[PDB]
Amino acid sequence: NGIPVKLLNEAQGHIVSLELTTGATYRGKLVESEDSMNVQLRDVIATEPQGAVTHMDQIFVRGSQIKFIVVPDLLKNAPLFK
Amino acid sequence: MLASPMLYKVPDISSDGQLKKFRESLVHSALCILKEQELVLYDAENDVIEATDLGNIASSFYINHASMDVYNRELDEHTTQIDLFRIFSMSEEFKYVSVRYEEKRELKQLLEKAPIPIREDIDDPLAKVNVLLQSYFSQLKFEGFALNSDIVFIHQNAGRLLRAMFEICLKRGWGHPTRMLLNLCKSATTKMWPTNCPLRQFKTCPVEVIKRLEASTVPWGDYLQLETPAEVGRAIRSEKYGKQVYDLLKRFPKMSVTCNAQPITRSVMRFNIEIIADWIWDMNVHGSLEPFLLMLEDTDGDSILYYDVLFITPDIVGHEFTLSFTYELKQHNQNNLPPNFFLTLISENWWHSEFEIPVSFNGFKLPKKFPPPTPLLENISISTSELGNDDFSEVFEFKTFNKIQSQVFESLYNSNDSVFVGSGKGTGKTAMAELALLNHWRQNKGRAVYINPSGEKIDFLLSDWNKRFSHLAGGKIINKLGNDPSLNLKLLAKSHVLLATPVQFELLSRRWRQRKNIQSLELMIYDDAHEISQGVYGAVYETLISRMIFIATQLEKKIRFVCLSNCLANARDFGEWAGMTKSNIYNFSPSERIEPLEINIQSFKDVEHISFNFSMLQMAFEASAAAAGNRNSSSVFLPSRKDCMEVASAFMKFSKAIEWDMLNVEEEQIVPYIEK
Amino acid sequence: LANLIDYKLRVLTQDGRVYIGQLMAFDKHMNLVLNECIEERVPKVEKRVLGLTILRGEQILSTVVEDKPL
Amino acid sequence: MKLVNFLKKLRNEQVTIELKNGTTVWGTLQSVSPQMNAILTDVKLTLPNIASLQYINIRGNTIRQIILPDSLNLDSLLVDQKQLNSLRRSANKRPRRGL
Amino acid sequence: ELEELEEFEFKHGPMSLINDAMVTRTPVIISLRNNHKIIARVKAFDRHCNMVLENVKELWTEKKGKNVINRERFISKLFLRGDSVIVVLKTP
Amino acid sequence: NEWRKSAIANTLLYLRLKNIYVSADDFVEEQNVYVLPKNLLKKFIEISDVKIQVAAFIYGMSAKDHPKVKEIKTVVLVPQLGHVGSVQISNIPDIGDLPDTEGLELLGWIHTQTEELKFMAASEVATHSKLFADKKRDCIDISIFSTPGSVSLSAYNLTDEGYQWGEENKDIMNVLSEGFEPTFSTHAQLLLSDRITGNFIIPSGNVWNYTFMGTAFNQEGDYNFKYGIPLEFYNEMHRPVHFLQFSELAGD
RNA sequence: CUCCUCAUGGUCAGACUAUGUAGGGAAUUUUUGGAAU
């Protein structure tokens, strides 16, 4: 498995932000992250490239479609320094 | 000198404006001391120069002449590990080295715990030099950097000097020094001792493991013999890394080596070596190839008999690889011979390879002194007039026979007995075979078997025979045999005379019982019977001979064997087995031939691993230039078509500069011949 | 890529956006984790502080040595 | 066989890599990964006005093509892997030869 | 055995065009995804259609403030990725 | 003492064979006589030490000219730990595996000393008995007296009483050696010739001298053997402890 | 050089780690392109 996959699994239960290949940003609490980067998310606030913002309850996006994630700074401590 | 003769001590002064005699006098002075050091060959009045092996070594490793003669005397047959360092220290390049008072404390600490003892003492610079050498082998970096500067000098020039000493001893043929020196050279190269395990020179082998093996007090052969990886980890008592260690072991050189010696004659002794290489290759660790020095040394390990460097390439590892060489013996060692000679293989790089297999002499009994060939009497008087029918005299396009052919002619052309005609390439064996054939025809016999192993010269000889021999007897059918057993059988019937290689005619004659034509063959010419020595084919050709003799005895048949061959020392025995008599046998020496021929053999260095080198090429061009400037015509032989092309372009380059590119003919004539 | 570890690196994305951050770890897919990562778009103009980010290896074009590690 | 190995041979070579995005790269290959990820040093890079960069690592799939020096010996570099595979793969009458 | 089958399938498949190109040292023209074309000789190939091409002449089409113009350049030693290949044409 | 002075002194050992003489005993065909070559002896002298006793086994067979003559073809150098005037030696070697052994009989053993005796001392006789107790009664011994400038070959035999004495008396036993006295040993017939030559067998580890390897030596224990060239008593292979101590002098 | 697979030697109660004449890194979530304009 990937070390960043391992971190991303640690990120479960936290509030993360996600940018997809389309450019829409989904901020919310990450329920579940599979090995394939498929992520289940809660109470998501979404900002579109046009600037419009919406709210949704439960969202699940495919791994392949995710440009990148931003995860909280708490995890930066360890154990990935090694 | 020209500018100021008396300043630089020219006595000649007014005499010799060009200082011819001054130059020549300096050369004289140089070549005396060089000759004393056996660097070059020189003679005062005749004035001929040539380079020796020691001189070549000094040239290669750029040893000063003083260092050179120091090596010459100080190295000895019995010199040991302690003396080797001393000699190294004595090397003239260290004359400028001297002990220092700030160096002296560390020196004092060293020389107590130094493994290799020192015959000299702290005040003497030589002792400082070889203790620095020891430190270098043992990997000691230093705080006080005066010592460290000196040891840098030793670092850069040490492997050089040691390697030179080793080559010198190898030329001398000394057994005790050469092995230890080879170990030292290896230690300068790889920076370690023998007691430090060879796993150190692997880049990937870890530190804890090598410490553990150093401290474990175990023979190296045992670790090498261990196979099971888990069992290796248990043996090295750390479970971790064991698999890695075993992988690296199979990457360490391991040889199952065998040698079968065998005498060619009493003086010359040939050794057939079987060298197997079990290790697995790596381009990173091993490099391009593996040079391995093969030493043939006596039963003591005192003096070297014979040596060669051999390259083990990636292709050879694991194959069953035979290596052959010859050695001439001594007079006393010839008379009484030892129980065995030692054959030892050492890696120029890898540590503690040390594969020594005894070369077994147990009841090896040498044969008798070589018997001389039958003498050449003085008679020329035999000629084409002696033979009976004058239709056979229009054949040879000459009248008087040769000196060697005149000797054999009486037993050959007159009687019908079994003749060993024998020797020489230049003296026509073709002609003597022709005479034998004529004698055979003369008696109304008609079946003739001419057997030469060289299939291309068979065809030439057929072309010459069919146009002339066949028509004079007037009916006789001369043929060459083809690949088919059926076709060469039908030829065996149709044709009076058959020409074939030993393989062909042995294959056809294998059923003599079933083919009754072969039971009836009256006369045979075995041409070039000296090629029975040649590989398996010679064995085929003696199978054919033996079969024919067995047929003669079994069928009570009178079969005339004419054995044509080259000069052979064991020839008379060979004729004896063929149903011959000492009077019928004629063996001559190679010197008996009628065109005195100088065999000039010239030996060059580092050529064993190559087809030719550039000095060989130059010398060949020089010889060719001598012949071409003379009226003589000359030819050069080469291993391949590729090699011929390379040498051709090379020759053209040599010629274009010098006066002679000459074809001894105009440039406009040659294109009409080569139009194709 | 292991030498680049802990360094400040500049990664160029597939869309042309420029990200800059400390390279803490990678993987086979070249998915990178970037600490204290900020985004620049046009060249400073339109710079944003993202923080700790993963980037996908499918989106990454190239990376260059920006500055020394903290 | 695998051309990526041929790229592995290309260390310390000065090349100009055109990329799928149109970017031009000029630099000395320090190494190429089997992914065809190419790490280079002393690189001038032109995006579709050159930027000079000490080191550049490029993801292999982004590489469009790599233009090699004309001096390169392709005959020698192409034939390796077959020889390596042959190396991985690898009685009385022995001496046809005599005395 | 598996290796044998792969080489054979390669020989009698569509791959035969680039195999034939390497053996005959014949020029082929490659329409790429950049809308550029490469007419060259095939020095080496790969299952991915990675290629070593010699005597490369690449032709492209450019638009300006007037009539469209074709542009072309010579690259003697060119190595090409396998995904940029749209089409490999073999012709006289 | 230690390695330095004796090891440096070892180089001069080739000089000890320039002069070779023995007190010449009457030649008698009644008992078997031995023929020893000049090269094997020389090599053994080279490998040996000026102080410490070095001792190997010696093997050969009877030639067909005289069955009573015994030609020493094969010296066999064995695992041992030597002292001044005494030595510890392993068992009788099992050499059947090697070639050039077709019924090679066990002739005896050879050793070095510095004292000129007409008899075998306690440390020697006891060792002899321990080697050959129930195995071969009539085997012989070669005691080489060595001093700078010349060496001397003193051959000896043994009767059945000495074996009993060695069986009973192993450690110390100086008084029972004194009572043992000169008489039991009988001067065996030995010759030195350049008309024949011989070879060495050595252990598989190629370290015969266990002087500084104290843990590895075993007085009764099995070892593989091979033909080869033996090393010096003080040689790099025999002195591994010194290199770890030499680099350990500077440390790290 | 990297990841996986496999093999392996070890350790722990499948995981981890060193090594490997090993296999591999083009058919949906990454490296053989849906990009091009």
Side-chain angles (χ1 to χ4, degrees), chain A, chain B residues 1-605 607 609-676, chain C, chain D residues 1-80 91 93-99, chain E residues 2-92, chain F residues 1-166 169-177 179-180 182-247 249-252:
Chain A
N1 64 337
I3 298 169
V5 179
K6 198 67 181 299
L7 192 159
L8 181 58
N9 291 340
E10 182 183 0
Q12 304 182 353
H14 298 83
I15 291 94
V16 298
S17 65
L18 283 158
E19 173 161 347
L20 201 154
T21 56
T22 58
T25 63
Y26 298 178
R27 295 183 182 176
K29 181 178 292 297
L30 174 62
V31 181
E32 174 176 348
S33 177
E34 304 183 2
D35 299 344
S36 184
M37 294 177 70
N38 302 338
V39 297
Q40 181 177 356
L41 186 75
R42 304 179 75 241
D43 290 345
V44 54
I45 181 168
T47 302
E48 289 295 317
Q50 298 183 341
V53 173
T54 188
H55 68 285
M56 305 186 300
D57 190 2
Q58 297 300 324
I59 188 70
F60 181 63
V61 67
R62 191 177 88 221
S64 178
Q65 288 303 326
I66 296 171
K67 283 177 180 175
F68 69 89
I69 197 167
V70 176
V71 295
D73 296 352
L74 200 162
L75 283 69
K76 75 191 180 82
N77 292 337
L80 301 197
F81 179 81
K82 295 186 297 183
Chain B
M1 298 295 180
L2 303 175
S4 296
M6 179 53 66
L7 198 157
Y8 283 105
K9 179 62 174 171
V10 177
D12 288 346
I13 188 167
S14 64
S15 299
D16 278 332
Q18 294 300 320
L19 301 176
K20 284 177 280 292
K21 185 60 172 167
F22 173 76
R23 285 175 289 177
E24 293 177 350
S25 179
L26 289 179
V27 175
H28 179 65
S29 297
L31 299 181
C32 294
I33 190 67
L34 289 168
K35 183 180 71 179
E36 175 64 18
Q37 301 180 344
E38 59 180 335
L39 300 176
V40 297
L41 295 173
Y42 175 66
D43 189 357
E45 183 171 355
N46 292 344
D47 190 10
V48 292
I49 306 301
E50 189 69 19
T52 65
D53 50 342
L54 271 65
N56 179 323
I57 299 300
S59 175
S60 293
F61 310 14
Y62 192 60
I63 304 300
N64 294 348
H65 58 79
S67 295
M68 184 63 183
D69 68 14
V70 172
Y71 294 141
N72 190 34
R73 61 181 174 277
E74 294 302 322
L75 293 170
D76 215 30
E77 295 88 352
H78 301 86
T79 192
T80 59
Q81 189 175 1
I82 298 168
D83 289 345
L84 296 176
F85 293 5
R86 186 188 68 191
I87 298 167
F88 167 78
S89 299
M90 290 177 178
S91 297
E92 182 68 11
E93 288 80 353
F94 302 105
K95 182 179 179 179
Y96 302 125
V97 176
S98 180
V99 64
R100 297 279 185 259
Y101 179 54
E102 70 282 5
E103 296 174 351
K104 185 184 285 288
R105 57 178 287 272
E106 299 191 4
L107 268 66
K108 188 64 173 174
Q109 286 175 328
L110 266 57
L111 272 68
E112 292 179 352
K113 294 177 179 177
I116 305 299
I118 297 99
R119 297 179 67 182
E120 290 83 1
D121 286 336
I122 185 167
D123 291 346
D124 185 347
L126 302 176
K128 183 181 72 66
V129 171
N130 68 348
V131 70
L132 291 172
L133 180 66
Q134 306 176 349
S135 299
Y136 169 69
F137 293 178
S138 297
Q139 293 92 358
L140 273 63
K141 62 179 179 295
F142 294 104
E143 292 179 348
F145 191 83
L147 293 173
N148 194 342
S149 65
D150 295 352
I151 196 167
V152 169
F153 183 85
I154 294 170
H155 164 56
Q156 60 182 18
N157 298 342
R160 180 173 68 91
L161 295 171
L162 296 173
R163 183 58 169 154
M165 292 168 68
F166 169 77
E167 290 299 319
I168 293 169
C169 292
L170 186 65
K171 301 300 183 186
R172 303 291 306 184
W174 294 346
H176 291 92
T178 186
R179 294 183 291 94
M180 294 175 182
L181 280 169
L182 182 56
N183 294 343
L184 295 177
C185 181
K186 291 162 62 178
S187 177
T189 304
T190 59
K191 288 174 290 292
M192 68 189 84
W193 292 105
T195 60
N196 294 343
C197 294
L199 294 178
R200 184 180 294 277
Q201 73 187 33
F202 291 94
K203 66 190 184 79
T204 187
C205 184
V207 179
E208 57 185 338
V209 172
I210 60 98
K211 298 297 184 181
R212 296 288 167 81
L213 300 198
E214 290 182 350
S216 62
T217 307
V218 175
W220 182 247
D222 290 346
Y223 297 170
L224 183 62
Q225 298 183 345
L226 295 175
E227 187 278 333
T228 302
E231 194 71 22
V232 168
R234 187 194 58 71
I236 297 173
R237 69 183 66 86
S238 175
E239 286 96 1
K240 298 294 284 187
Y241 301 121
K243 179 59 165 60
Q244 177 171 347
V245 173
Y246 172 65
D247 288 338
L248 295 173
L249 294 181
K250 292 195 295 183
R251 290 178 178 81
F252 178 83
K254 184 178 179 180
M255 300 176 189
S256 299
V257 180
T258 307
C259 181
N260 293 340
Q262 291 172 335
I264 296 168
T265 186
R266 188 188 64 201
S267 62
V268 175
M269 188 68 74
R270 183 183 65 195
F271 302 5
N272 297 346
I273 301 170
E274 295 176 350
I275 294 169
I276 300 168
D278 295 350
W279 72 93
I280 292 169
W281 192 261
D282 187 3
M283 292 293 289
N284 299 131
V285 180
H286 293 82
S288 297
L289 55 79
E290 286 298 323
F292 286 164
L293 208 155
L294 184 147
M295 289 182 184
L296 172 63
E297 56 184 338
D298 62 347
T299 307
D300 191 8
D302 180 61
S303 178
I304 297 169
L305 300 179
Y306 171 81
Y307 65 84
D308 49 343
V309 176
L310 63 84
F311 295 158
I312 297 298
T313 59
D315 292 342
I316 292 172
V317 295
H319 293 282
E320 173 177 354
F321 176 79
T322 306
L323 198 154
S324 178
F325 66 87
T326 59
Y327 175 71
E328 78 283 359
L329 296 174
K330 300 303 184 182
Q331 194 64 47
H332 63 282
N333 192 29
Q334 197 182 12
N335 293 347
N336 292 127
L337 61 82
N340 54 344
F341 294 121
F342 292 98
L343 187 153
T344 307
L345 295 178
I346 303 98
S347 176
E348 294 181 353
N349 190 28
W350 289 96
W351 265 98
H352 198 282
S353 179
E354 283 185 351
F355 295 97
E356 66 190 349
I357 61 101
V359 178
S360 175
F361 290 79
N362 55 32
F364 286 2
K365 295 180 180 297
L366 296 173
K368 186 180 178 181
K369 292 182 177 177
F370 60 89
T374 64
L376 176 61
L377 297 174
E378 179 72 17
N379 51 342
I380 190 167
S381 64
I382 291 97
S383 179
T384 54
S385 297
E386 200 285 333
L387 54 79
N389 189 29
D390 287 338
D391 290 344
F392 300 151
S393 179
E394 305 179 0
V395 173
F396 296 92
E397 62 267 352
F398 60 84
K399 184 177 175 294
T400 304
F401 292 103
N402 204 40
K403 287 180 70 71
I404 296 169
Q405 304 183 347
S406 297
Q407 185 75 71
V408 181
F409 184 84
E410 184 70 18
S411 297
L412 195 153
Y413 188 82
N414 292 343
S415 63
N416 204 36
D417 286 337
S418 297
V419 184
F420 177 58
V421 175
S423 66
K425 178 184 170 60
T427 306
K429 290 184 293 293
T430 304
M432 296 183 288
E434 294 174 345
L435 290 170
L437 183 68
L438 295 173
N439 186 29
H440 187 59
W441 292 358
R442 185 171 63 85
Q443 300 174 342
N444 290 346
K445 301 294 189 176
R447 295 292 185 85
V449 179
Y450 179 82
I451 299 168
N452 192 34
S454 180
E456 294 94 8
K457 191 181 81 176
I458 291 171
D459 177 61
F460 174 80
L461 186 140
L462 180 73
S463 67
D464 292 354
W465 285 8
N466 194 338
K467 62 175 66 180
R468 48 189 289 188
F469 297 162
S470 178
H471 70 275
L472 281 171
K476 303 299 183 182
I477 295 172
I478 317 301
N479 280 333
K480 186 185 73 65
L481 278 65
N483 297 351
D484 287 356
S486 296
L487 176 57
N488 69 39
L489 170 66
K490 295 180 176 179
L491 291 166
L492 168 61
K494 294 185 297 183
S495 179
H496 291 275
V497 176
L498 65 86
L499 275 62
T501 65
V503 182
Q504 295 169 334
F505 175 56
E506 188 280 344
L507 175 60
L508 172 59
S509 61
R510 67 172 58 215
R511 292 179 292 105
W512 57 269
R513 297 171 64 89
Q514 295 75 356
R515 295 281 160 85
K516 68 184 184 68
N517 291 335
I518 297 168
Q519 301 182 346
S520 64
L521 297 174
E522 283 177 344
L523 181 142
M524 295 177 73
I525 300 102
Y526 298 134
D527 184 63
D528 298 351
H530 69 89
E531 303 186 2
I532 64 173
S533 64
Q534 184 174 356
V536 299
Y537 294 95
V540 179
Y541 177 46
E542 57 166 324
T543 55
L544 174 56
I545 308 302
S546 297
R547 184 183 301 171
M548 292 309 300
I549 291 168
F550 181 80
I551 291 170
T553 303
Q554 191 64 46
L555 278 66
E556 296 175 348
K557 194 72 187 298
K558 184 178 179 180
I559 297 170
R560 186 172 187 256
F561 303 109
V562 179
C563 293
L564 302 177
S565 179
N566 190 332
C567 300
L568 303 179
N570 298 134
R572 61 180 296 275
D573 185 4
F574 168 67
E576 291 178 350
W577 178 83
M580 295 176 182
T581 307
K582 289 184 292 186
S583 63
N584 292 337
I585 295 168
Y586 298 93
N587 188 31
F588 301 94
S589 178
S591 62
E592 291 301 332
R593 57 180 172 272
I594 50 96
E595 289 307 326
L597 185 144
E598 294 176 350
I599 298 169
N600 187 30
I601 297 171
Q602 284 296 319
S603 62
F604 304 9
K605 300 177 176 76
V607 68
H609 313 93
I610 54 173
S611 63
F612 59 84
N613 62 345
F614 200 84
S615 180
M616 292 171 84
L617 186 63
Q618 294 184 343
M619 184 168 283
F621 180 80
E622 297 180 356
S624 179
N630 292 335
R631 181 177 181 170
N632 285 272
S633 62
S634 65
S635 63
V636 181
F637 300 1
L638 293 174
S640 66
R641 184 182 70 87
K642 289 177 63 65
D643 297 357
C644 291
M645 296 295 178
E646 299 177 356
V647 172
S649 178
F651 281 190
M652 291 190 289
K653 285 172 59 181
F654 291 112
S655 63
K656 291 173 180 176
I658 308 301
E659 297 182 357
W660 178 87
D661 196 7
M662 192 183 289
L663 195 145
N664 297 131
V665 165
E666 300 174 355
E667 297 181 356
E668 182 172 354
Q669 175 173 346
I670 55 176
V671 175
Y673 294 171
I674 58 173
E675 293 301 332
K676 268 68 178 179
Chain C
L1 184 61
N3 181 319
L4 305 179
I5 207 68
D6 290 341
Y7 291 186
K8 286 184 177 297
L9 299 182
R10 176 193 296 267
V11 54
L12 177 62
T13 60
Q14 192 184 9
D15 296 353
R17 301 181 182 176
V18 179
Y19 299 176
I20 298 172
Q22 284 178 320
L23 175 69
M24 295 304 279
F26 55 86
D27 62 346
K28 183 52 197 175
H29 305 282
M30 292 287 284
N31 298 338
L32 304 183
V33 293
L34 300 179
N35 191 33
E36 70 183 356
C37 181
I38 62 173
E39 174 177 357
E40 59 182 344
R41 296 181 182 176
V42 174
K44 286 179 173 295
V45 69
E46 293 302 323
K47 57 180 179 295
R48 292 183 181 274
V49 178
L50 301 180
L52 180 59
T53 183
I54 197 172
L55 181 63
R56 178 182 300 177
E58 182 180 2
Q59 190 178 0
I60 178 173
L61 291 179
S62 61
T63 183
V64 303
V65 177
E66 191 70 36
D67 287 337
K68 61 181 179 296
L70 201 167
Chain D
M1 296 296 181
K2 271 63 178 182
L3 274 59
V4 181
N5 303 339
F6 173 77
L7 281 81
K8 297 178 179 71
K9 295 172 169 71
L10 296 178
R11 294 175 182 168
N12 290 114
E13 292 297 321
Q14 186 185 6
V15 298
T16 61
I17 301 169
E18 196 73 15
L19 283 76
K20 287 175 176 177
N21 61 354
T23 298
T24 302
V25 172
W26 171 92
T28 57
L29 294 166
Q30 281 186 327
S31 298
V32 67
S33 181
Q35 292 177 327
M36 297 176 69
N37 296 344
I39 59 172
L40 295 85
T41 188
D42 189 15
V43 183
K44 72 178 169 66
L45 195 150
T46 305
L47 291 90
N49 293 332
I50 303 171
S52 67
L53 260 39
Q54 291 172 327
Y55 299 91
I56 293 174
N57 182 23
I58 297 171
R59 186 177 66 88
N61 191 32
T62 66
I63 292 172
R64 180 178 202 77
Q65 64 186 26
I66 172 175
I67 290 94
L68 302 175
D70 295 354
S71 300
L72 190 67
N73 50 339
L74 264 41
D75 300 344
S76 295
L77 292 185
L78 287 188
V79 176
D80 185 5
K93 79 200 180 178
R94 297 293 183 192
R96 63 181 72 83
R97 170 72 175 77
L99 300 182
Chain E
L2 180 62
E3 177 180 359
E4 299 306 334
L5 272 58
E6 297 178 354
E7 299 177 354
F8 170 75
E9 181 72 19
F10 177 85
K11 175 60 175 173
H12 75 82
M15 298 286 113
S16 304
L17 299 180
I18 203 166
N19 191 345
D20 187 342
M22 79 164 288
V23 55
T24 55
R25 298 182 62 175
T26 189
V28 299
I29 182 170
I30 303 170
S31 73
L32 296 172
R33 293 179 62 74
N34 57 358
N35 295 333
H36 310 314
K37 273 64 180 181
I38 291 174
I39 179 70
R41 297 204 299 268
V42 183
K43 183 56 177 172
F45 55 77
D46 195 359
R47 174 181 295 183
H48 303 95
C49 298
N50 296 333
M51 291 169 70
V52 179
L53 288 169
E54 285 179 343
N55 294 280
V56 172
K57 187 65 176 175
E58 61 166 330
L59 176 67
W60 62 94
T61 303
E62 295 183 356
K63 183 65 175 294
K64 58 176 177 176
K66 61 188 185 70
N67 290 329
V68 189
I69 59 171
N70 288 332
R71 297 281 290 150
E72 67 195 357
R73 66 176 181 187
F74 180 83
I75 302 299
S76 180
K77 299 298 182 63
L78 172 56
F79 178 76
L80 182 67
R81 185 68 175 169
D83 283 350
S84 297
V85 174
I86 292 174
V87 164
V88 177
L89 176 73
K90 186 174 80 62
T91 194
Chain F
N1 295 131
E2 294 92 2
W3 57 278
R4 294 182 295 102
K5 185 65 181 296
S6 296
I8 293 171
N10 289 0
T11 301
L12 300 177
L13 268 58
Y14 65 90
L15 291 167
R16 293 186 179 178
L17 283 82
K18 303 301 182 183
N19 282 267
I20 301 171
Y21 276 97
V22 185
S23 177
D25 190 343
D26 178 57
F27 296 160
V28 178
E29 290 177 343
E30 193 76 27
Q31 60 176 7
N32 297 351
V33 58
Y34 296 170
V35 179
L36 199 144
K38 290 178 178 178
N39 63 337
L40 294 180
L41 176 62
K42 183 181 77 179
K43 182 56 170 168
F44 186 79
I45 295 301
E46 295 186 359
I47 68 169
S48 178
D49 187 14
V50 299
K51 297 180 180 180
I52 296 169
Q53 295 193 338
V54 173
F57 297 10
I58 61 107
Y59 290 178
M61 62 170 77
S62 298
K64 295 173 182 175
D65 178 61
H66 285 90
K68 293 189 174 303
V69 172
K70 309 290 274 186
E71 297 177 350
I72 298 167
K73 293 181 178 181
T74 301
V75 177
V76 175
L77 182 57
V78 293
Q80 50 180 0
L81 189 154
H83 309 284
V84 177
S86 61
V87 63
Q88 288 167 318
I89 295 172
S90 65
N91 291 337
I92 289 172
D94 172 61
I95 60 165
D97 56 340
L98 295 173
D100 296 350
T101 67
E102 290 86 345
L104 285 173
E105 304 184 2
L106 158 59
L107 302 179
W109 68 297
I110 185 168
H111 68 88
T112 53
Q113 61 176 19
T114 64
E115 71 278 7
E116 189 172 7
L117 299 177
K118 289 182 171 69
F119 52 90
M120 292 166 64
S123 297
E124 303 175 1
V125 172
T127 302
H128 190 85
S129 176
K130 183 170 170 58
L131 296 176
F132 304 105
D134 292 340
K135 304 178 180 82
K136 191 167 183 287
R137 295 286 185 182
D138 59 340
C139 68
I140 72 111
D141 187 15
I142 303 104
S143 177
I144 299 167
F145 173 76
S146 182
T147 192
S150 63
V151 298
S152 295
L153 286 69
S154 298
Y156 297 105
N157 297 128
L158 183 64
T159 64
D160 295 355
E161 293 83 350
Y163 292 100
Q164 190 181 5
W165 182 92
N169 303 328
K170 53 173 179 289
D171 191 12
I172 306 173
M173 300 293 104
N174 299 345
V175 176
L176 296 176
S177 177
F180 177 80
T183 335
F184 232 14
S185 36
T186 57
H187 185 270
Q189 296 180 336
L190 180 62
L191 296 174
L192 186 63
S193 176
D194 57 340
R195 289 183 285 101
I196 61 103
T197 55
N199 58 347
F200 286 14
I201 293 173
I202 55 176
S204 179
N206 190 27
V207 285
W208 55 271
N209 185 35
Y210 293 177
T211 299
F212 302 96
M213 295 180 283
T215 59
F217 178 72
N218 187 27
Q219 201 175 9
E220 294 181 348
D222 191 12
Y223 293 92
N224 286 269
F225 292 93
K226 62 179 181 178
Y227 288 96
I229 294 95
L231 304 177
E232 195 76 3
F233 181 73
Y234 296 105
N235 192 23
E236 58 196 344
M237 298 303 297
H238 296 156
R239 291 183 290 101
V241 287
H242 303 70
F243 296 96
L244 296 174
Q245 185 174 355
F246 179 81
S247 63
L249 179 63
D252 292 344

